[PDB]
Amino acid sequence: SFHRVDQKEITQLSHLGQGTRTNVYEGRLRQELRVVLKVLDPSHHDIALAFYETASLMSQVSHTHLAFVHGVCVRGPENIMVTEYVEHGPLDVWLRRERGHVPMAWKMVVAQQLASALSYLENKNLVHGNVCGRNILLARLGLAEGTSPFIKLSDPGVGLGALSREERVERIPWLAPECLPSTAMDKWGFGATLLEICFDGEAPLQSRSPSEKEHFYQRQHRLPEPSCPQLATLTSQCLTYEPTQRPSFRTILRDLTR
Amino acid sequence: SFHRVDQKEITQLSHLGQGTRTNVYEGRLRELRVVLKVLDPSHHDIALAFYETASLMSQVSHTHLAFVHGVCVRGPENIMVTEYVEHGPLDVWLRRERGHVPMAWKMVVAQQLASALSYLENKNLVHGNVCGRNILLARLGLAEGTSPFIKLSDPGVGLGALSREERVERIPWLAPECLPSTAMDKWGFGATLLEICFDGEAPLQSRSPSEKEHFYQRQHRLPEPSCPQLATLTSQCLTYEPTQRPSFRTILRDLT
Ligand SMILES: CNC(=O)c1cnc(Nc2cc(C)c(F)cn2)cc1Nc1cccc(C(=O)NCc2ccccn2)c1OC
Ligand SMILES: CNC(=O)c1cnc(Nc2cc(C)c(F)cn2)cc1Nc1cccc(C(=O)NCc2ccccn2)c1OC
């Protein structure tokens, strides 16, 4: 399951963002490590249980491209997951700031590294369920000459099962359409993230309204094809409404290495 | 000497601070993110000292030395266009992270500062403004197994063009021989290592100009660093006799 952390061992620093029912802060863990604290909102037992399952999944795994989870601190109305601090933070933010100046090869190295960590979770028959640019952290940047990127996939936060329909609609286009009303969902998540990467942090449908987003899935519309034809075949296969028709990560990984 | 930049190619954004006769702003260069060092309305000797600074930085190349794009000169305007280093001045970071900066982190910063100064020593060039504020953090070195990465900024208006009042303001970083050679950067380095050790708090910093001048006039020596890891190096560097200061080749070997 997961390691337990005392309130005394953690220091909450600057605010980094807000997730689904969470607030993200930089922090210190006690000699002293830089950590990232995911503070759950005052929640019911079913919400908190979904949070512990997330901590468990991440605690019980080990992969070079998967972010480490130290444990969980239980403090009054808040629950605090203590996770790995990664030098450069989310990928989507860096993609928007570096818009137009990110090489194909850089995006191609990041695809393989994401497939590998997901291939690893596929072999263990485990589900991430929140693959998106925001959950991709850059350990090493790779935008500078002679540098190659190194990513770590973050924890998926509160499990998708505990979210309302409104919250699941907010996750379009990354949310697999079968989850709107299995490991197959991470292949859709992966395909949508590859489109976000290709479009330098701009996911299709991101700007559009919840009704427009729901309508797109309700009408079985397909997402745009990526700008780079090296991934067009892979994304079309991944972003199919039939879960069984999505390739395995073992296949995906072989297709990128060629 | 230096590259010339047109007024049209630069956009001045937010104000970051004030230096000796300058105002530091964030900006864009045609749009690449830069730092603009806007010289105050100055006389020709002041502007000439500003161009010499741009030259020194333009004509060098080092991994731990900040890049200078060029200078924009139009009417009374003198704008040095320099590299934007992600996290900014080291002294600011050090005060905000006071008590939580490891000894190992500081030695990295020290070796990298010593490297960019050994490089300038081999080319027989003078920086003349080594201080925490002129040390910029490119990479923070906060994640496990990662090291900080620094870049030494341009020294701003050359020390030669400054008044006595302005030189007194530079104590304890200003070498005492400059109060009334490459040897000065060894004092600058020594004083910066004390500032780093004391988490951004340089000794004498709070004290008055008369108190500061009095300290140098009376030949008093600066406090010894908290970490005995650098106590021998700083005592050697912060000697009033310029010739008695070790070379950066020596300093670098002592740090490795
Ligand atoms: C497991 N470790 C992590 O999560 C982690 C590690 N290191 C970081 N470093 C770092 C470093 C710098 C310099 C920096 F400026 C920012 N951050 C950031 C990390 N998290 C993180 C940070 C900020 C926002 C989010 C966030 O919006 N989360 C909620 C969300 C919204 C939408 C979709 C998905 N999730 C966030 O979570 C990914
Ligand atoms: C090559 N250009 C640089 O050095 C530079 C590059 N990147 C920066 N990034 C950055 C980033 C963040 C997040 C930030 F919040 C600020 N800045 C800041 C940079 N300069 C800079 C900025 C502000 C003040 C000074 C300054 O006090 N100068 C005058 C002075 C006073 C006393 C002693 C010596 N010099 C200053 O110059 C060092």
XYZ file of C-alpha atoms and ligand atoms in Angstrom:
590
model
C 0.000 0.000 0.000
C 1.686 3.355 1.135
C 4.170 4.845 3.629
C 2.804 7.085 6.406
C 4.297 10.575 7.017
C 3.994 12.756 10.156
C 2.928 16.444 9.954
C 6.206 17.406 11.792
C 8.442 16.063 8.915
C 6.869 18.338 6.222
C 7.155 22.065 5.389
C 4.696 23.610 2.880
C 6.287 26.235 0.636
C 5.051 28.019 -2.516
C 1.774 27.133 -4.337
C 2.276 25.507 -7.757
C -1.279 24.807 -8.871
C -4.623 23.198 -8.218
C -5.758 19.727 -9.426
C -9.025 17.823 -9.198
C -9.990 18.463 -5.517
C -6.327 19.310 -4.717
C -3.853 22.131 -4.187
C -0.195 21.528 -5.225
C 2.653 23.103 -3.177
C 6.411 22.897 -3.208
C 7.794 21.634 0.112
C 10.485 20.062 2.265
C 10.529 16.509 3.727
C 12.836 15.632 6.723
C 18.643 15.156 5.451
C 16.011 17.473 3.834
C 14.486 16.676 0.411
C 12.637 18.974 -1.988
C 9.174 17.479 -2.417
C 5.774 18.338 -3.973
C 2.748 18.199 -1.652
C -0.690 17.365 -3.107
C -3.147 18.617 -0.479
C -6.638 17.090 -0.803
C -9.642 19.448 -0.236
C -11.931 18.660 2.814
C -13.447 15.433 1.365
C -15.656 12.411 2.200
C -14.186 8.928 2.903
C -14.823 7.662 -0.666
C -12.890 10.693 -2.123
C -9.968 10.130 0.359
C -9.982 6.367 -0.360
C -9.528 7.131 -4.124
C -6.599 9.403 -3.061
C -5.007 6.521 -1.024
C -5.407 4.124 -3.995
C -3.417 6.676 -6.125
C -0.679 6.813 -3.442
C -0.665 2.962 -3.320
C -0.375 2.474 -7.136
C 2.613 4.900 -7.195
C 4.217 3.568 -3.937
C 4.063 -0.092 -5.136
C 5.686 0.662 -8.551
C 9.217 1.509 -9.722
C 10.135 2.937 -13.102
C 12.715 5.409 -14.353
C 9.908 7.414 -16.114
C 7.430 7.308 -13.171
C 7.429 9.847 -10.318
C 8.225 8.597 -6.808
C 5.700 8.815 -3.934
C 7.227 9.215 -0.460
C 3.958 8.541 1.329
C 0.863 10.301 2.751
C 0.360 12.614 5.725
C -3.145 12.645 7.345
C -3.740 16.266 8.805
C -7.360 17.127 9.933
C -9.668 18.036 6.977
C -6.610 17.746 4.621
C -4.667 14.643 3.380
C -1.227 15.274 1.931
C 0.500 13.106 -0.609
C 4.317 13.706 -0.508
C 5.764 13.179 -3.993
C 8.994 13.612 -5.987
C 10.049 17.203 -6.897
C 11.148 17.218 -10.549
C 13.460 20.134 -11.638
C 11.424 21.647 -14.484
C 7.765 20.868 -13.562
C 4.910 20.100 -16.011
C 5.606 19.576 -19.751
C 2.485 21.437 -21.039
C 3.717 24.726 -19.467
C 7.179 24.334 -21.057
C 5.634 23.430 -24.423
C 3.538 26.669 -24.495
C 6.466 28.830 -23.397
C 8.736 27.191 -26.049
C 5.973 27.183 -28.759
C 7.459 26.932 -32.257
C 10.991 26.131 -30.991
C 10.531 22.435 -29.967
C 12.081 19.922 -32.437
C 10.289 16.805 -33.736
C 13.105 14.586 -32.311
C 12.491 16.138 -28.796
C 8.750 15.279 -29.065
C 9.715 11.830 -30.397
C 12.069 11.104 -27.409
C 9.176 12.147 -24.999
C 6.677 9.807 -26.807
C 8.960 6.695 -26.332
C 9.579 7.597 -22.664
C 5.816 7.955 -22.023
C 5.066 4.681 -23.891
C 7.759 2.857 -21.916
C 6.336 3.830 -18.454
C 2.820 2.955 -19.709
C 4.138 -0.365 -21.218
C 5.559 -1.106 -17.782
C 2.131 -0.380 -16.172
C 0.473 -2.586 -18.911
C 2.718 -5.600 -18.079
C 1.719 -5.210 -14.384
C -1.941 -4.755 -15.584
C -2.280 -1.389 -13.735
C -4.158 1.762 -14.786
C -2.795 5.353 -14.579
C -6.046 6.945 -15.877
C -4.830 10.591 -16.107
C -2.226 10.757 -18.870
C -1.915 14.436 -19.993
C 0.867 16.977 -20.583
C 0.266 18.441 -17.097
C 1.103 15.007 -15.504
C 4.344 14.751 -17.490
C 7.215 16.283 -15.526
C 10.586 17.169 -17.078
C 13.528 15.893 -14.897
C 16.050 17.026 -17.581
C 14.886 19.685 -20.123
C 16.506 18.740 -23.470
C 15.609 21.977 -25.342
C 19.276 23.189 -25.138
C 21.791 21.797 -27.733
C 23.278 18.385 -26.880
C 20.583 17.747 -24.257
C 17.882 15.054 -24.507
C 14.677 15.292 -22.337
C 14.021 13.005 -19.381
C 10.404 12.714 -18.204
C 8.652 11.245 -15.125
C 4.895 10.542 -15.188
C 3.182 12.050 -12.089
C 0.606 10.309 -9.883
C -2.888 10.421 -11.484
C -4.374 12.318 -8.452
C -7.902 11.354 -7.114
C -8.959 8.216 -9.040
C -11.326 8.791 -11.985
C -13.967 6.559 -10.297
C -14.558 9.145 -7.523
C -15.144 12.059 -10.003
C -18.546 13.557 -10.971
C -19.723 13.696 -14.657
C -18.901 17.475 -14.732
C -15.284 16.654 -13.652
C -14.985 13.830 -16.227
C -16.268 16.219 -19.019
C -13.489 18.667 -17.958
C -10.931 15.900 -18.819
C -11.967 15.792 -22.541
C -9.965 15.267 -24.832
C -7.675 13.184 -22.576
C -10.555 11.286 -20.901
C -11.336 8.022 -22.855
C -14.954 8.272 -24.224
C -15.955 4.950 -22.496
C -15.307 6.721 -19.123
C -17.818 9.480 -19.945
C -21.163 7.798 -18.771
C -9.495 -0.937 -18.051
C -5.879 -0.386 -19.289
C -7.495 0.559 -22.696
C -8.217 4.137 -21.397
C -4.423 4.930 -21.034
C -4.042 4.261 -24.791
C -6.623 7.069 -25.485
C -4.909 9.272 -22.781
C -1.561 8.577 -24.499
C -2.926 9.415 -28.007
C -4.545 12.699 -26.804
C -1.241 13.662 -24.987
C 0.745 12.991 -28.173
C -1.598 15.466 -29.978
C -1.066 18.032 -27.135
C 2.742 17.511 -27.519
C 2.553 17.865 -31.322
C 0.466 21.091 -31.001
C 3.065 22.563 -28.533
C 0.849 22.331 -25.438
C -2.430 23.244 -27.181
C -4.781 20.185 -26.877
C -7.710 20.144 -29.354
C -11.142 21.038 -27.721
C -9.303 22.551 -24.651
C -10.800 26.071 -25.253
C -14.341 24.759 -26.154
C -17.296 24.637 -23.580
C -18.393 21.527 -21.511
C -21.501 21.075 -23.692
C -19.349 21.356 -26.898
C -16.862 18.813 -25.346
C -19.642 16.373 -24.345
C -21.331 16.864 -27.796
C -18.042 15.864 -29.563
C -17.911 12.489 -27.737
C -21.765 12.008 -27.908
C -21.562 12.446 -31.742
C -18.484 10.051 -32.002
C -16.364 12.794 -33.726
C -12.663 12.043 -34.133
C -9.781 14.298 -32.921
C -7.547 16.181 -35.424
C -4.634 14.349 -37.035
C -1.163 15.429 -35.719
C 0.945 17.988 -37.682
C 3.846 15.438 -37.937
C 2.947 12.354 -40.081
C 5.378 10.151 -38.007
C 2.676 9.909 -35.297
C -0.548 10.191 -37.456
C -0.944 6.384 -37.742
C -0.250 5.803 -34.035
C -2.728 8.520 -32.809
C -5.510 7.384 -35.226
C -5.141 3.826 -33.813
C -5.064 5.072 -30.171
C -7.937 7.578 -30.469
C -10.533 4.978 -31.601
C -13.866 4.890 -29.706
C -13.678 1.013 -29.558
C -11.337 0.224 -26.575
C -10.413 -3.284 -27.907
C -9.246 -1.736 -31.267
C -6.431 0.266 -29.441
C -2.871 -1.156 -29.872
C -0.868 -2.478 -26.864
C 1.997 -0.397 -25.379
C 4.358 -3.262 -26.393
C 3.221 -2.548 -30.024
C 3.313 1.312 -29.623
C 6.880 1.124 -28.158
C 8.111 -1.048 -31.119
C 6.480 1.414 -33.622
C 8.370 4.453 -32.088
C 11.801 2.680 -31.874
C 11.607 2.153 -35.724
C 34.398 44.905 -29.054
C 30.511 44.617 -29.127
C 27.483 43.999 -31.377
C 25.201 46.973 -32.113
C 21.401 46.713 -31.534
C 18.639 48.982 -32.962
C 15.963 50.522 -30.669
C 13.234 48.900 -32.880
C 14.436 45.306 -32.026
C 13.924 45.705 -28.235
C 10.824 45.812 -25.972
C 11.194 46.851 -22.317
C 8.979 44.897 -19.917
C 8.895 44.686 -16.078
C 11.493 46.411 -13.800
C 13.773 43.966 -11.962
C 16.115 46.282 -10.066
C 18.687 49.105 -10.027
C 22.458 48.877 -10.347
C 25.275 51.460 -10.274
C 23.830 54.143 -12.615
C 21.506 51.492 -14.177
C 17.960 50.124 -14.207
C 17.384 46.495 -14.914
C 14.291 45.447 -16.908
C 13.018 42.209 -18.391
C 12.600 42.484 -22.181
C 12.333 40.963 -25.656
C 14.887 40.986 -28.484
C 13.768 40.443 -32.150
C 10.941 37.751 -29.661
C 13.791 36.190 -27.474
C 13.615 36.948 -23.671
C 16.483 39.196 -22.523
C 17.564 41.501 -19.656
C 18.017 45.189 -20.452
C 20.580 47.230 -18.524
C 19.505 50.797 -19.084
C 22.239 53.312 -18.257
C 21.051 56.548 -16.497
C 21.540 59.879 -18.439
C 25.387 59.872 -18.218
C 28.557 61.662 -19.407
C 30.779 60.188 -22.175
C 33.331 58.731 -19.709
C 30.511 56.821 -17.886
C 29.093 55.505 -21.228
C 32.614 54.524 -22.362
C 33.078 52.446 -19.141
C 29.672 50.846 -19.982
C 30.919 49.922 -23.518
C 34.130 48.399 -22.071
C 31.901 46.141 -19.866
C 29.851 45.094 -22.950
C 33.147 44.436 -24.825
C 34.710 42.241 -22.073
C 31.500 40.098 -21.974
C 30.980 40.065 -25.804
C 34.606 38.934 -26.477
C 34.482 36.036 -23.945
C 32.817 32.596 -23.894
C 32.331 30.430 -20.811
C 29.634 28.068 -19.589
C 29.469 30.010 -16.245
C 29.521 33.528 -17.813
C 26.393 35.416 -18.949
C 26.006 36.205 -22.634
C 25.849 39.792 -23.955
C 23.817 40.253 -27.160
C 25.084 43.780 -27.733
C 24.321 47.434 -26.953
C 21.580 49.783 -28.107
C 22.923 53.371 -28.410
C 20.406 56.048 -29.532
C 20.660 59.710 -28.493
C 21.026 59.633 -24.661
C 20.047 55.923 -24.378
C 22.614 53.221 -23.549
C 20.993 49.768 -23.265
C 23.009 46.635 -22.788
C 21.003 43.567 -24.018
C 22.027 40.532 -21.956
C 21.075 36.893 -21.287
C 17.889 36.201 -19.131
C 18.875 33.602 -16.572
C 15.757 31.675 -15.371
C 15.940 32.089 -11.537
C 17.872 35.343 -11.219
C 20.273 36.634 -8.544
C 21.821 34.102 -6.140
C 21.771 36.492 -3.130
C 17.935 36.809 -3.316
C 17.601 33.012 -3.537
C 20.000 32.518 -0.612
C 17.962 34.833 1.703
C 14.650 33.187 0.716
C 16.170 29.687 1.325
C 18.074 30.778 4.501
C 18.923 27.819 6.740
C 17.961 25.223 4.090
C 20.987 25.479 1.707
C 23.434 22.524 1.995
C 27.223 22.881 2.234
C 27.616 20.613 -0.862
C 25.292 22.951 -2.934
C 27.547 25.987 -1.961
C 30.800 24.134 -2.960
C 29.250 23.471 -6.446
C 28.417 27.244 -6.794
C 32.010 28.026 -5.502
C 33.794 25.688 -8.050
C 31.687 27.155 -10.928
C 32.388 30.787 -9.854
C 36.123 29.869 -9.473
C 36.035 28.279 -12.948
C 34.672 31.378 -14.715
C 37.280 33.487 -12.824
C 40.216 31.056 -13.620
C 39.127 31.310 -17.240
C 39.265 35.162 -16.980
C 42.692 34.874 -15.178
C 44.212 32.781 -18.013
C 43.028 35.474 -20.513
C 44.385 38.131 -18.023
C 40.964 39.929 -17.854
C 39.261 41.626 -14.890
C 35.557 41.225 -13.933
C 35.801 43.694 -10.980
C 32.263 43.196 -9.535
C 32.068 39.658 -8.148
C 29.128 39.524 -5.654
C 26.095 37.301 -4.981
C 23.872 39.746 -6.937
C 26.007 39.203 -10.106
C 25.715 35.414 -9.769
C 22.648 34.172 -11.614
C 21.082 30.741 -11.134
C 20.295 29.069 -14.429
C 19.343 25.691 -12.756
C 18.428 25.637 -8.970
C 19.857 22.191 -8.069
C 16.826 21.473 -5.791
C 15.856 18.002 -7.120
C 17.853 14.968 -5.757
C 21.177 14.275 -7.522
C 20.958 17.598 -9.426
C 23.463 20.421 -9.135
C 22.926 24.232 -9.331
C 24.182 25.962 -12.483
C 25.387 29.561 -12.238
C 26.180 32.319 -14.742
C 28.351 35.328 -13.778
C 26.682 38.577 -14.967
C 28.427 41.535 -16.630
C 30.183 43.754 -14.031
C 28.091 46.855 -15.058
C 29.795 50.354 -15.332
C 33.552 49.770 -14.854
C 34.891 50.485 -11.354
C 37.241 53.185 -12.800
C 34.276 55.473 -13.628
C 32.775 55.309 -10.074
C 33.031 58.028 -7.362
C 34.546 57.285 -3.895
C 30.988 57.196 -2.380
C 30.024 54.485 -4.960
C 33.202 52.467 -4.282
C 32.519 52.647 -0.480
C 29.011 51.204 -1.225
C 30.783 48.110 -2.728
C 32.497 47.197 0.611
C 32.988 44.284 1.531
C 33.192 43.025 -2.099
C 35.346 45.964 -3.329
C 39.120 45.098 -2.978
C 40.685 47.599 -0.447
C 43.372 48.693 -3.004
C 40.491 50.096 -5.169
C 39.276 52.349 -2.338
C 41.583 55.485 -2.849
C 44.683 44.195 -11.532
C 43.219 40.622 -11.606
C 44.144 40.484 -7.843
C 40.886 42.395 -7.032
C 38.659 39.447 -8.294
C 40.351 37.205 -5.676
C 39.090 39.604 -2.909
C 35.658 39.828 -4.698
C 35.586 36.003 -4.805
C 36.554 35.748 -1.102
C 33.870 38.230 0.006
C 31.214 36.431 -2.195
C 32.115 33.078 -0.616
C 31.408 34.669 2.820
C 28.057 36.031 1.488
C 27.237 32.475 0.198
C 28.231 30.889 3.523
C 26.104 33.404 5.490
C 23.061 32.603 3.240
C 23.042 35.943 1.397
C 24.022 38.109 4.391
C 27.439 39.730 3.598
C 29.369 41.054 6.654
C 29.332 44.939 6.937
C 26.321 45.100 4.499
C 23.981 46.738 7.081
C 26.723 49.089 8.529
C 27.100 52.841 7.481
C 29.507 54.217 4.757
C 31.776 55.748 7.430
C 31.811 52.385 9.369
C 32.583 50.575 6.036
C 35.391 53.008 5.081
C 36.740 52.902 8.704
C 36.997 49.047 8.496
C 39.267 49.219 5.400
C 41.206 52.351 6.590
C 41.973 50.447 9.918
C 43.011 47.236 7.939
C 40.438 45.078 9.862
C 39.826 41.572 8.541
C 36.411 40.075 7.601
C 34.767 37.317 9.737
C 35.801 33.722 9.142
C 33.148 31.581 7.325
C 30.773 29.302 9.340
C 32.041 26.227 7.392
C 35.767 25.437 8.078
C 35.703 23.920 4.548
C 36.433 27.448 3.124
C 38.065 29.251 6.152
C 41.626 28.768 4.788
C 40.656 29.827 1.251
C 38.801 33.037 2.382
C 41.594 34.085 4.816
C 44.058 33.700 1.894
C 41.788 35.673 -0.527
C 40.775 38.474 1.865
C 44.357 39.686 2.502
C 45.053 43.437 2.087
C 48.294 42.634 0.132
C 47.137 41.890 -3.490
C 50.282 39.793 -4.318
C 49.586 37.491 -1.276
C 46.212 36.319 -2.842
C 46.282 32.785 -4.385
C 45.728 32.289 -8.158
C 42.387 30.919 -9.444
C 44.333 27.886 -10.761
C 45.323 27.253 -7.071
C 41.796 28.081 -5.673
C 40.153 25.711 -8.240
C 42.552 22.823 -7.267
C 41.799 23.449 -3.519
C 37.993 23.246 -4.258
C 38.164 20.001 -6.357
C 4.583 13.799 -8.636
N 5.232 15.096 -8.667
C 4.645 16.164 -9.203
O 3.440 16.179 -9.444
C 5.515 17.357 -9.517
C 6.907 17.313 -9.407
N 7.726 18.352 -9.599
C 7.196 19.489 -10.018
N 8.132 20.508 -10.142
C 8.017 21.865 -10.422
C 9.183 22.621 -10.545
C 9.077 23.949 -10.948
C 10.321 24.762 -11.184
C 7.809 24.475 -11.169
F 7.656 25.756 -11.547
C 6.687 23.665 -10.987
N 6.786 22.382 -10.622
C 5.833 19.625 -10.269
C 4.958 18.586 -9.953
N 3.546 18.789 -9.954
C 2.751 19.898 -10.348
C 3.162 21.228 -10.248
C 2.311 22.244 -10.638
C 1.025 21.966 -11.051
C 0.567 20.650 -11.116
C -0.876 20.479 -11.476
O -1.470 21.340 -12.119
N -1.483 19.368 -11.060
C -2.923 19.208 -11.142
C -3.406 18.815 -12.517
C -4.143 19.694 -13.308
C -4.538 19.280 -14.569
C -4.195 18.020 -15.012
C -3.464 17.206 -14.161
N -3.072 17.577 -12.930
C 1.454 19.612 -10.790
O 1.092 18.283 -10.892
C 1.560 17.598 -12.056
C 23.037 39.295 -17.746
N 21.900 39.781 -16.998
C 21.684 39.410 -15.746
O 22.592 39.371 -14.944
C 20.318 38.911 -15.381
C 19.804 37.784 -15.997
N 18.683 37.169 -15.643
C 18.034 37.640 -14.625
N 16.926 36.902 -14.323
C 15.935 37.068 -13.400
C 14.955 36.118 -13.174
C 14.036 36.361 -12.164
C 13.002 35.339 -11.806
C 14.102 37.460 -11.515
F 13.176 37.668 -10.577
C 15.071 38.383 -11.794
N 15.988 38.189 -12.733
C 18.464 38.746 -13.912
C 19.599 39.450 -14.303
N 20.030 40.648 -13.694
C 19.561 41.441 -12.627
C 18.234 41.551 -12.258
C 17.879 42.299 -11.172
C 18.816 43.010 -10.476
C 20.144 42.988 -10.863
C 21.006 43.959 -10.140
O 20.829 44.178 -8.962
N 21.912 44.618 -10.847
C 22.577 45.787 -10.315
C 23.505 45.442 -9.178
C 23.262 45.854 -7.885
C 24.185 45.547 -6.918
C 25.306 44.845 -7.250
C 25.461 44.459 -8.548
N 24.586 44.740 -9.512
C 20.520 42.177 -11.929
O 21.808 42.126 -12.368
C 22.617 41.117 -11.803
